[PDB]
Structure formats: structure tokens, C-alpha cells
């Protein structure tokens, strides 16, 4: 008296036209198919934009045993949505959830059991042009005139290899200390989504994970290695629809000995080719 | 029963009528004895100093996830404990929690509270890490059996957890723990990886933390793919760019926050350096290793670099660029890292490979004008260990007494020697390593004062015990240079004075061996009254040792039958008094023996080398000696410690005086069978015990004895001495009272033949039947019809009983 | 099928000799000695090794001056078709008597018998019994002679047939001599 579902592929990723297989196994039932897009309201950025509610990707029930031991069953869905409706990326984030789902449910005189299944979005055309950028840490990079006068005199220097990264490619660089009065304690990187809601409109960066790249003071003058790697379902193709946007930034943050704080924001671009 | 009479022997017509015809051989006639490698030294032991050296008293603090003030064991005790839970998690299926266990442990490598505990703390999580990095594998390589999607899956789901740590030391530890999975990815993972984390190294900022990363990074890559040395060389060259901060301001700033000295930060990064250079340099080609010379030498303090340099290239590298060491090594800052400990681990390189002849003599010069010049005595010997094997290898005796005169000067003043016996023990073992020849070793001037130094009692018996092996096993031929007598003369002295009640019997012989050795090779030519001379003062000089006191009697016996071989029996009126000491010598000499047996024996065998000078009246005084010895001899007796019975050695003692009293003389003013007589007396009153039977057959070989000696030629003679056979000239009375003792001699072994058979002990009769048969067949007259009478009925006795 | 036996004794080292003659341990070669027969007087642990590296059957037993005493007064050992007693020879009364040997024989009744007490090398047949005293192979003195000439006996048995070849040193030269037995 137990249920499984067991997806074909062990990854669970399936793209925009393949079709879903897999086998149930037990030990009447019915199994649904379900992607939504959960936005969640938040605080009022700028009527209330009362239209951020819930969109449903697909939907598909089948009938899979009409009214022991182990028992397996073999099913299958096409992932197909009419014309023009695209299957969105699964992305777990905090104010916009894309999630597909198959939930098993028998029926008795009902056990269930819920699987979630990623989705890729297609690869883009393709023109993939990188695009580097340069940047200087500098004590004019804190935007308060009060604070800056206790800032130490620092420089550092960095190259980012691109911000418009591919989702399966690490974001890779370098950042050079070259002069900086203070010692620093902490070199890290902050990928920080921003999700926005509704239209004219709710937007919000919240932190997915923290790297830190250098580790106390650093040679000045050594070119500490910018690496990154996207985390798996909390990073998505940076996508917009007229309900919602999903983009991703980078903040290099520098941290000094006295306990001071420097932010750099870049804001990437990511895609999959 | 009945009287005997001797069957008439004629020993030379029997053995002529009974020997075998023999035909020569000519030259020609076939006769049947005609005619990663083993170079690598793995991290497994590296460990085991690592963490011995590296101990530190103060209370430690090991904060995961708050403990303080814990002792060293007790951070060992729960690093295991973090270990243990390690394993328990992942047999339990909990693996997040391995992981996250694994990335605090590394994260404890983060920390510097206490930087002398820095390296064998490296040593332990290293460990866990370890444990880590072979038990993921498995799981994936279980899963396995271009894997399978399932272990691909597996694969890239801890790669990816463990690329979604924050901090850069754990998430670079456990990255490059788990190094070797990235054979499931693709077949260029790893050569995609190990730059990668060489770079990523660059981050931390603390130089001992990144130099202890980077040889992690090393012996992860050694030990998953050693064939990425390209990669690896970027280690190298980084560190190099690194090396500037290790005495820059900030590190300073740290060790006064924490109150560490220089001096003892600075040997806290040997221990990795040494693994980083030794991983870089293996099987490298001498141009990489020549270009890492010139960019360590390029540097500024890099009196450190230099020590990895020598503790990690090949021998003969250093060894002929060793020159350019000394250069190197003599510019190099005092208040910094210790120039002996450079010195030495230089002395270490030139110990395995020969630098070039024409530099061999300033070398040794200039290594030990800063030798000589240290303080402290204890860095000074471990300089001094190492140097002295070269300066012995390559120099000649001359060098070898200007160095340990040095070393002399240096430890004498302030009783140092305590604090470095077992190195001492070391130098004095390479110079007896290298000097075979013992006229040459002593000629040495400051050999003997360096044995001096040795002046406690334990630490010195075993230099002697050195000195001896090495002569024993290096001299094949007796010498005599009186250089070498008196010197080890005075080592076995030093030696045997060790002897006390305390002392074992196995150390008591191993002492005996060595005593023993020296004293078989000391041969005074024809100078036969100074080797006694020698052995004069050899009993005087180890008495207590009972095994040298054997050896001396059997080699002053040898000594004086080697005169009567030299002189071919003609004694001189000179040397029949020295032959006359010599056994009067033996006389002395064997009383003072402990053990029973060994003093019989020995009292025999200096009877018959007594008799065989013509002096008759000191072999009587033997042999009585000998006989008033016999009634001592034990029932129960000692052999190889355990306890044995002492019947048939007592027989086979007996037999052996018997046997040999056949030859000896009677002195006319004493009556004939005169020691025989005292002996029947003793062996009669003998306390033989009661469920012994061999008694008769001592009387069996009495028998045998006197009927052998009642013949008119004895079977063997002495050289120049007159037997029974020729001085009583076959008398008549001799051999009446020799048939007298017959006849006392049968009525005791009949009477004990009839005690048996009253016993009712028929086995033990019918044997002693059998025995005295044969002995009847063997030397009774069966022509007299009494003994033949006597003979048939005992055949029958011993017939009716089996 | 050939049996090659190197009957020994009397090497008293070093009681009475450094070593044995240099050119025996030449003539000695290791893998070439099926079976060593000591009569005793090894007095070492040392010359016991030494025989140890010349063969892989090694029969050794009690003198009057060993230093080892576990070592059997009397030993009988079948090689071949023929049985070989082994005692070291100052257990006869007198030394070397043929009457004491032949006792020996009865009551073991063995083959051959090796006594080797007197230095002075023998070999004879008596009663169809087979005798040999090999003598000191380091010549060490012995109160019964005047001169000891170091001697070593090879026995060789094949079938019911040995031939013995005796090595002795006289002067500087390895004289070897030759004898027949076999087994009526």
C-alpha cells in the first residue's frame, strides 16, 4: 500500500517538445500533469496591480487503472502547448516559483504522491557574443559622500569575462588588489535575483548564494580568480513576460579590516545555447 | 666367582688384515669436488613526523557549527569523534550531513588561534578529508556497475553542492577531495580542474594556510593523476609569487597580536614546501629544476626556499651545484631561518651523491667554518652526525681527527653529552663505518677521548658492542700493531666492567662472543712467552666473564701444543719451563670456573695436553683433581636454561677419564691402577639413584678398560710418554691384580644382577644380560671355559626373560 | 641415482683452530652437498651455519666439548639403501677400539658406523661392516698423534655401491683418495 512515480531520465530534465515517460510502481489510480507559475505579492513598489495571480503552463490528467505485490505501470504525456504558449524554465525562486509537477492519487473506500520535474527552456537562436567587462573598486564606488570620507584609500581592478553568461558555463574572471591602505578581509560574490511582479509592479533582489574568492589580505598585485557556478533551479535564462521578470545581478562586495563594505553590482545576462 | 681373561689383541696385525685397500688419484681422476614509483615518498610517512614534531602545550579550541580549552589529545580525541560521525553518516544514508561535518572540519583549517599546532592539525582533518574524498568515489563507482546516467547524476549533484560553498578554504578542500570523481564527467575533468583550483589557491590570503592548500592540491594530484605535472608546476611558480608575504608586515603584525616569535613560525612551512617541492621535482628534467634554482635564488629572504630545494630535488643535482649552495646559503639572513639546519639538510644531499673532485675540499672547509662556530650544542651535533659521513667517505684520517676533535671541544664544556648520546652513537658508527683497517682507525688521535665522552654505563656498552662487531667482521688476519691491542684492551675492559649480578645470561654470552673475538685474533708470533704474557693478563683483566675464562684455557693448551708442534717434541731445556707454566697456568685457571661439567671437561683435556710435554707429575695432580671433582656432579643439571637430567653426561664422562686414563702412567711409589682404583672408589660410592641402572654399565666399560689395558700394546701411545704397556713391561703381578679387580669388578655386577632379578624388574635385567654378554663377546676370553660358562648363561638368562 | 654425503668432524672452532683450511671451504661449494654427517666438536653456533649454507640435510651430534648440548649422543640415518650410525667417538673405551665399534653396530644395527674421537683418519671392513673416522677437517690437536694432517670424507652412494673420497691436506696439497664398499 505505497506509491512511486520513477521519471524515465535520471537528471528529470525534459525540453519544450519531448515527451514525459516513466513508470509507476506500487507496492483505481490516476496521475495529473500540472506547471504553474506562483507570484507571490509582495510590498507595493508604485491600482495595486491586482493581476498577479497564478498562471497555469500545462495541464493534462490521465486515467491510468480503472477501480498484492509490486506492481509497475508504464505512462507517458506530450509536453506540447497549443501554438504560441511557451514552456517556461523551472525556477525556484522566492517571489516567482515556475514549477511542473506529476502527482499520482489512487483512489480507496486516496494516496498520493507528488514529483517534481525540471524543464529547459529551448537554446537561443544564437549570436552568442560575450561581453567583457572592465571595472575599478575604488572609494568612489560607495554612493554616499557622508560615509566615504572613512572609507580607506583602495583600488582594485577586475575583468569579468562576460555578463552575458551561459547558464552552463561558470562566470570566470579577474580581480587584482592593486593598492589597498586597510587589509581586506573578505572578497566574495552575491548572485542576487531581481524578480518583479504585475505591470504598472512589485520588484525585489533578494540573495541566492554567496562565494567568497579571496580569503584574507590578498598579494597586491595577484589576479585572484573570479569563479562561479550557477546553482542548479535558482538561476533561470533571465526572463520577461508582461506578469513577471526574472533577471540576475552580481554584487562584488569587498570587505576591510575595520568593518567596512564596498558593493560593485553588475547585472548579468544569462541564456542558454 | 667367575674369573676373566683377556682375549690377546694385536692392533696393528688386525688393522693391517682389516683395512681396506685404497688407490690414489692422479691429476685428471675424477673426485666428485672437482669444479607514482618507489622513489616517491609518500605522505603516509611524512605524517608520522608531522605530527610528532609539531606539538604544542597550550589549551586549543575547536569551534564547529562552542568548545574551549582543550589539551592536544584531546583535539585529537574529537577530530576522531568528527571522523567516526563521518562514517556513521554516510553507512547511515545521511549524506548532507557528511558533508556538512567535512566543510566544518575544513573550516577549522581556516583558523591560526594557534600556529604551532597548524601542521599536524593540517595532518588530521587532511585525513577526514581523505576519508571523504575515497568514500564518495565508491558510492559513484558503485553506482557504476561514461557511467551510467544514475552515477553521472550523482556525480555532478556533489559537484554542485559543493561548488555552493561559501567560504574558499572548505569549499577548496572538499572540491579537491572528492578531485578524482571528475573521472565521471569527461576524460579531460581533471586537467580541466586542477589549474582551476591552483588559481583558486591564489585567494587565501594567509601564507601558511595557502602554502599547507597548495600541498594538499600537490598530493591530491599526485595521488589521483600524476601525469598533470604541467598543471602542478603553476603551484609552484604561484607560491613563489606568494613567498613575499611570509615576512611582510602583516604576518608580523599577527604573530606579535599572538606573541610567536620568528623563529618558531618560520619551521612551521617546511612541512609543506618540502611535500609541494618534492611532488614538483619528481622525475623532473634538470632544466625545470634548474629554472626553479634561478627563481628561488632570484628572491629576497628565500633562506627558507633554499632548505625545501635541498629536501626535495635529487641528490645529485645538489650535489654538483653544491657550491653554488654554500654561496647561496652564506649570504642568507641570520635573524630569519637557521643557516645548520640549511647546512644540514646540504650534508644530507652529499651524503647520497658525490659532488665534483675539485670542490670536495673547499666544500668541507667552508661547511665547517660555520659548523664550529655554533652555540648550541644540540644543532651542532645534528650538523655534525650528517657532515662526519662525508668527511669520512671522501677525506682521509687527518680530516677525521680535525672533526672530532671539533665535536670534542664543542660538547665537553657544559656536560652536553646527556642531551645528545644517540647522535654521538651515530658519528662514532660512520667512523668506524668508513675505517675497515684497525691500524688506521686508532691511528686516529682523538678516537680513544671520543669514547671518553661516553661516560654513562649503557649509552658506552653499546659503542663497544659497535667497535667489536666491526672487528670481528673486518679483520681476517691476526695482527699485532700494539696501537690496536691496548685500545681494545681498554673497550673490552669498558665493556666486561659492565658485568654485575643484575646482568642476564644472553648478555653475559654476547659479551663472552665479542671478549672472544678479540682475543682469537691477537697472535704473537713465535713469541710464545708473550702470547702467555697476553693471556696472563687476560684472566687478570675478565675474570668475571666465565665464557672468556673457557676460551683462555682452551687457547693456552693450543698455545702449548703449538710449541710442541713447532719443536717437534724435542723440548729444550728454555722452553720445557715455559711449557711447565703453561699448564701450571691451566691449573690455576680452571678451579676458578663456575659451571660443573665444563670444569670436568676441561680438566681432562688439560690432563691429556699435560701428558703430551713428557711432565708427568702435574697430569697426576690433573687427574686426581678431576676425580676429588666427580663426587660434585648434580643429579639434575642446566641446559639452554631449561632443566635436564645429568645421567648420561655423568656416563659419558666417566667413559671419556676411563678412556683416557688407559694411557696414563702409574707412579712407582704408589701402587698399580692407582687413579683407576680412586675412581672405581668414587663411581662405587656415587649416590646413583635408585631407578638407575647405567652404574653397571660403567662397570661394563670398567671391563672393557682393563682388559683393553691388560693387552701387551696399547691400541694408542703418547709421543714420549712410557704406559703400563712399556713401563710395567707386561708384568706378571700387574696383570694378577689386574684380574683381582676383574673378579671385584663381575661380583658387583653380579650381585646387582641378582638384586634385579629379585626386584622382579626382568626388562632392566634381561637388557643388563644383553649388555654384559656382548661386553663378553667383545673382550672375555671365550676359550676359558669358566667365562664362556659365565657368558652362555647369561644369554640364556637374558633369553628367558625377552 | 646418486647420493653425495660429506662426512665431517673434529672442527673445534674455535677452541683449537681459527677455521678450516682455506683450501677446503674452496673444494666446498653450497647446492652441491645432498647430506652433512658431523661427528661433533662444531663447538659453535657459527660452524653449524656454516654447514647450514653447504647443504639442506644437516646430522650433527653431541661431542665432548659442544656448545649446544641438545645435540643426540647417537644418531642412525637412512640415506639411500643404506643406513648410516653416527657418534662422536670418545664414548668408546679405549678410543678406536674395533671391538667397541663393532659392539656400536650390534646394538644399532646399522650399516656403517662413523667414530671419529682419534684425529687420525681410518677407513676398513671388518665383518662385512663398513668403518670410517674421517679425522679433523681443521686438523685440531689431539694428544693420540703427533702430526694431524686435516681430513674430510665424501661418501657417494648409489644403490647397494658407495665410494668414498677422502680429502686430506698434507703440506699444501689436497691429496683425495679413493675406496670401494658394497653391500653383500
Redesign the interface.
Same mark, same amino acid.
Not at chain 3, 690437536?141 to 693420540?144: D, G, Q, R, S, T
Not at chain 3, 691429496?175 to 664398499?181: A, G, L, N
Given at each position: 500500500t505505497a506509491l512511486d512515480i520513477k521519471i524515465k531520465r535520471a537528471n528529470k530534465v525534459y525540453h519544450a517538445g519531448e515527451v514525459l515517460s516513466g513508470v509507476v510502481v506500487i507496492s483505481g489510480v490516476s496521475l495529473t500533469m500540472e506547471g504553474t507559475v506562483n507570484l507571490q505579492l509582495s510590498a507595493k513598489s508604485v491600482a495595486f496591480y491586482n493581476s498577479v495571480k497564478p498562471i497555469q503552463i500545462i495541464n493534462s490528467t490521465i486515467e491510468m487503472v480503472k477501480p498484492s505485490g509490486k506492481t509497475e505501470i508504464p505512462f507517458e504525456f506530450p509536453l506540447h502547448l497549443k501554438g504560441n504558449k511557451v514552456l517556461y524554465e523551472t525556477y525556484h525562486g522566492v517571489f516567482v516559483n515556475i514549477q511542473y509537477t506529476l502527482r499520482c492519487d489512487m483512489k480507496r473506500s486516496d494516496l498520493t504522491k507528488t514529483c517534481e520535474f525540471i524543464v529547459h527552456s529551448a537554446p537561443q537562436k544564437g549570436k552568442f557574443t560575450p561581453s567583457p567587462v572592465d571595472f575599478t573598486i575604488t572609494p568612489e564606488t560607495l554612493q554616499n559622500v557622508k560615509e566615504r570620507a572613512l572609507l580607506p584609500k583602495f583600488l582594485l581592478r577586475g575583468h569579468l569575462n562576460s555578463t552575458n553568461c551561459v547558464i552552463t558555463q561558470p562566470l570566470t574572471g579577474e580581480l587584482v588588489v592593486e593598492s589597498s591602505e586597510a587589509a581586506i578581509r573578505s572578497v566574495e560574490l552575491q548572485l542576487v535575483r531581481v524578480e518583479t511582479c504585475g505591470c504598472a509592479y512589485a520588484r525585489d533582489a533578494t540573495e541566492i548564494q554567496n562565494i567568497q574568492i579571496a580569503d584574507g589580505d590578498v598579494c597586491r598585485g595577484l589576479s585572484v580568480p573570479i569563479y562561479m557556478v550557477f546553482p542548479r533551479l535558482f538561476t533561470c535564462p533571465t526572463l520577461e513576460t508582461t506578469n513577471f521578470k526574472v533577471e540576475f545581478e552580481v554584487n562584488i562586495v569587498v570587505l576591510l579590516h575595520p568593518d567596512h563594505l564596498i558593493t560593485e553590482n553588475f547585472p548579468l545576462k544569462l541564456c542558454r545555447i | 666367582v667367575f674369573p676373566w681373561h683377556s682375549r690377546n689383541r694385536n692392533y696393528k696385525a688386525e688393522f693391517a688384515s682389516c683395512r681396506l685397500e685404497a688407490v690414489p688419484l692422479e691429476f685428471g681422476d675424477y673426485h666428485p669436488l672437482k669444479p607514482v614509483g618507489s622513489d616517491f615518498e609518500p605522505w603516509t610517512n611524512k605524517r608520522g613526523e608531522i605530527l610528532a614534531r609539531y606539538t604544542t602545550t597550550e589549551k586549543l579550541s575547536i569551534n564547529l557549527f562552542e568548545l574551549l580549552n582543550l589539551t592536544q589529545q584531546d583535539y585529537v580525541n574529537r577530530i576522531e569523534e568528527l571522523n567516526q560521525s563521518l562514517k556513521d553518516a554516510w553507512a547511515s544514508d545521511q549524506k548532507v550531513k557528511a558533508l556538512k561535518i567535512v566543510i566544518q572540519c575544513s573550516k577549522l583549517l581556516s583558523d591560526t588561534s594557534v600556529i604551532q599546532f597548524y601542521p599536524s592539525k593540517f595532518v588530521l582533518i587532511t585525513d577526514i578529508l581523505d576519508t571523504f574524498g575515497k568514500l564518495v568515489y565508491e558510492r559513484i563507482f558503485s553506482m557504476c556497475v561514461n557511467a551510467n546516467d544514475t552515477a553521472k547524476e550523482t556525480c555532478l549533484n556533489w559537484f554542485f553542492k559543493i561548488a555552493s560553498i561559501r567560504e574558499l578554504i572548505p569549499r577548496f578542500y572538499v572540491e579537491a577531495s572528492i578531485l578524482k570523481c571528475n573521472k565521471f564527467l569527461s576524460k579531460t575533468g581533471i586537467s580541466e580542474c586542477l589549474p582551476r583550483l591552483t588559481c583558486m589557491i591564489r585567494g587565501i590570503g594567509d601564507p601558511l594556510v595557502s602554502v599547507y592548500a597548495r600541498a594538499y592540491l600537490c598530493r591530491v594530484g599526485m595521488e589521483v593523476a600524476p601525469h598533470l605535472k604541467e598543471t602542478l608546476n603553476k603551484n609552484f611558480f604561484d607560491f613563489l609569487l606568494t613567498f613575499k608575504q611570509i615576512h611582510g608586515d602583516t604576518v608580523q603584525n599577527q604573530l606579535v597580536v599572538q606573541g610567536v616569535e620568528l623563529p618558531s613560525y618560520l619551521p612551521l612551512y617546511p612541512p609543506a614546501m618540502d611535500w609541494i617541492f618534492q611532488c614538483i621535482s619528481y622525475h623532473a628534467p634538470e632544466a625545470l629544476l634548474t629554472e626553479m634554482m634561478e627563481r628561488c635564488k632570484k628572491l629576497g629572504n628565500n633562506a627558507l626556499l633554499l632548505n625545501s630545494v635541498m629536501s626535495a630535488f635529487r641528490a645529485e643535482f645538489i650535489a654538483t651545484r653544491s657550491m653554488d649552495f654554500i654561496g647561496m646559503i652564506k649570504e642568507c639572513d641570520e635573524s630569519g631561518f637557521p643557516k645548520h639546519l640549511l647546512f644540514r639538510s646540504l650534508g644530507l644531499n652529499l651524503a647520497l651523491a658525490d659532488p665534483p673532485e675539485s670542490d670536495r675540499l673547499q666544500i668541507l672547509n667552508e661547511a665547517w667554518k660555520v659548523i664550529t662556530k655554533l652555540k648550541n650544542p644540540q644543532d651542532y651535533i645534528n650538523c655534525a652526525e650528517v657532515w662526519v659521513e662525508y668527511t669520512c667517505k671522501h677525506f682521509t684520517k687527518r680530516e677525521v681527527n680535525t672533526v672530532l676533535a671539533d665535536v670534542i671541544k664543542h660538547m665537553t664544556p657544559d656536560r652536553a653529552f646527556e642531551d645528545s648520546y644517540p647522535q654521538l652513537q651515530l658519528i662514532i658508527k660512520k667512523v668506524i663505518a668508513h675505517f675497515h683497517d684497525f691500524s688506521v682507525l686508532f691511528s686516529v688521535e682523538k678516537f680513544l677521548p671520543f669514547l671518553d665522552m661516553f661516560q654513562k654505563e649503557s649509552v658506552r656498552v653499546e659503542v663497544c658492542k659497535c667497535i667489536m662487531d666491526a672487528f670481528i667482521k673486518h679483520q681476517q688476519e691476526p695482527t699485532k700493531d700494539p696501537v690496536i691491542l691496548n685500545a681494545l684492551l681498554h673497550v673490552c675492559k669498558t665493556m666486561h666492567d659492565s658485568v654485575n649480578a643484575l646482568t642476564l645470561e644472553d648478555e653475559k654470552r654476547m659479551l663472552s662472543y665479542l671478549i672472544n673475538g678479540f682475543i682469537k685474533m691477537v697472535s704473537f708470533g713465535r713469541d710464545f712467552e708473550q702470547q702467555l704474557s697476553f693471556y696472563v693478563e687476560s684472566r687478570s683483566m675478565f675474570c668475571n666473564l666465565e665464557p672468556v675464562l673457557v676460551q683462555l684455557i682452551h687457547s693456552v693448551n693450543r698455545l702449548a701444543m703449538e710449541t710442541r708442534k713447532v719443536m717437534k717434541g724435542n723440548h729444550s731445556r728454555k722452553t720445557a719451563a715455559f711449557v711447565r707454566a703453561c699448564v701450571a697456568y691451566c691449573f690455576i685457571t680452571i678451579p676458578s670456573l663456575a659451571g660443573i661439567f665444563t670444569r670436568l671437561n676441561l680438566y681432562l683435556h688439560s690432563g691429556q695436553v699435560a701428558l703430551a710435554n713428557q711432565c708427568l707429575s702435574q697430569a697426576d695432580a690433573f687427574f686426581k683433581a678431576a676425580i676429588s671433582l666427580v663426587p660434585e656432579v648434580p643429579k639434575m643439571i642446566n641446559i639452554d636454561g631449561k632443566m635436564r637430567p645429568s645421567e648420561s653426561f655423568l656416563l659419558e664422562f666417566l667413559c671419556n677419564f676411563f678412556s683416557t686414563l688407559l694411557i696414563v702412567p702409574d707412579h712407582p711409589e704408589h701402587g698399580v691402577l692407582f687413579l683407576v682404583r680412586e675412581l672405581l672408589n668414587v663411581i662405587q660410592d656415587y649416590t646413583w639413584e635408585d631407578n638407575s641402572d647405567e652404574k653397571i654399565r660403567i662397570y661394563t666399560c670398567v671391563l672393557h678398560l682393563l682388559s683393553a689395558m691388560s693387552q701387551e700394546t696399547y691400541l694408542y701411545h703418547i709421543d714420549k710418554v712410557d704406559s703400563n704397556d712399556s713401563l710395567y713391561g707386561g708384568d706378571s703381578k700387574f696383570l694378577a691384580e689386574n684380574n683381582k679387580l676383574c673378579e671385584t669388578v663381575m661380583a658387583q655386577i653380579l650381585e646387582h644382577l641378582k638384586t634385579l632379578a629379585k626386584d622382579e624388574a626382568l626388562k632392566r635385567q634381561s637388557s643388563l644380560g644383553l649388555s654384559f654378554f656382548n661386553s663378553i663377546l667383545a673382550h672375555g676370553d671365550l676359550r676359558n671355559n669358566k667365562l664362556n660358562q659365565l657368558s652362555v648363561n647369561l644369554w640364556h638368562l637374558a633369553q628367558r626373560h625377552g | 641415482g646418486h647420493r653425495?654425503v660429506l662426512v665431517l668432524g673434529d672442527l673445534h672452532i674455535?677452541? $683449537?683452530c681459527?677455521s678450516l683450511p682455506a683450501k677446503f671451504k674452496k673444494?666446498?661449494v653450497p647446492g652441491?652437498i645432498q647430506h652433512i654427517l658431523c661427528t661433533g666438536n662444531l663447538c659453535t653456533k657459527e660452524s653449524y651455519d656454516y654447514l647450514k649454507t653447504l647443504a639442506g640435510d644437516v646430522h650433527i651430534v653431541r661431542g665432548?666439548?659442544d656448545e649446544?648440548?641438545?645435540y643426540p649422543?647417537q644418531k642412525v640415518v637412512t640415506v639411500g639403501q643404506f643406513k648410516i650410525g653416527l657418534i662422536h667417538g670418545?664414548?668408546?673405551?679405549?678410543?678406536?677400539?674395533?671391538?667397541?665399534l663393532?659392539?656400536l653396530q $650390534?646394538?644399532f644395527d646399522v650399516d656403517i658406523l662413523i667414530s671419529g674421537h682419534?684425529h687420525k683418519f681410518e677407513?676398513?671392513?671388518?665383518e662385512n661392516k663398513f668403518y670410517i673416522n674421517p679425522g679433523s677437517a681443521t686438523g685440531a690437536?689431539?694428544?693420540?698423534e703427533?702430526?694431524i694432517i686435516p681430513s674430510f670424507v665424501?661418501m657417494?652412494i648409489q644403490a647397494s655401491t658407495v665410494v668414498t673420497?677422502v680429502?686430506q691436506l698434507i703440506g699444501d696439497d689436497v691429496?683425495?683418495?679413493?675406496?670401494?664398499?658394497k653391500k653383500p
Open positions: - | - | 653425495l674455535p677452541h $683449537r681459527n673444494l666446498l652441491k665432548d666439548f649446544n648440548l641438545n649422543e670418545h664414548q668408546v673405551i679405549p678410543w678406536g677400539d674395533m671391538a667397541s663393532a659392539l $650390534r646394538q682419534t677407513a676398513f671392513e671388518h690437536y689431539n694428544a693420540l703427533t702430526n665424501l657417494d673420497y680429502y691429496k683425495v683418495e679413493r675406496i670401494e664398499y
